[PDB]
Amino acid sequence: GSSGSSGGPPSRRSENRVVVSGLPPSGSWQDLKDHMREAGDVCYADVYRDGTGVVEFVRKEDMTYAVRKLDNTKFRSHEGETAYIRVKVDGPRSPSYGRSRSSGPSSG
Numbered sequence: 001g002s003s004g005s006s007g008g009p010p011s012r013r014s015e016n017r018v019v020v021s022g023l024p025p026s027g028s029w030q031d032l033k034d035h036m037r038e039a040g041d042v043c044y045a046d047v048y049r050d051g052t053g054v055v056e057f058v059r060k061e062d063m064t065y066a067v068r069k070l071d072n073t074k075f076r077s078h079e080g081e082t083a084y085i086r087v088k089v090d091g092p093r094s095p096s097y098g099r100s101r102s103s104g105p106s107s108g
Contacts, residue, residue: 002096016043016063017090020053023075024083029053031078035085039066054090063089 011017020032033045036055040062047053057063067087075085 011090014056014090016058016060017054017056018063018067018087019090020047020055021051021086022084023047023051023053024077024079024081025051026079026081027053027075027077027083032075032085035075036062036066036070036087038070039063053085055087 006012018036023032027047029045029047032047032053033042033055036042036045036057039057041058042055043058044056045053046055055066057066067089071087072084074082076082
């Protein structure tokens with residue numbers, strides 16, 4: 001247990017939700033989801049008016065794959081506008097660790 005904080009978003013008990021960034025001002029969920037399909041099948045789609053979005057792949061397989069192949073690619077909206085978007089597995093970013101006290105024994 002590397003500590004944790006809750007009390008806001010419902011995100012819990014899940015494990016197939018990725019975050020989308022770099023979305024165009026005309027890009028809509030309806031379209032965004034059409035781009036995540038490449039991975040497999042979409043279960044949930046939603047975009048915000050901040051160039052960001054979120055997709056939930058019914059099969060974790062499609063998720064891990066999307067973040068590999070469908071990550072940092074040029075996404076095109078139904079309007080014909082293109083824009084590079086980034087995809088990643090929702091959750092804690094960057095690895096965690098610590099010690100508090102310097103560790104340096106004699107022998108190895």
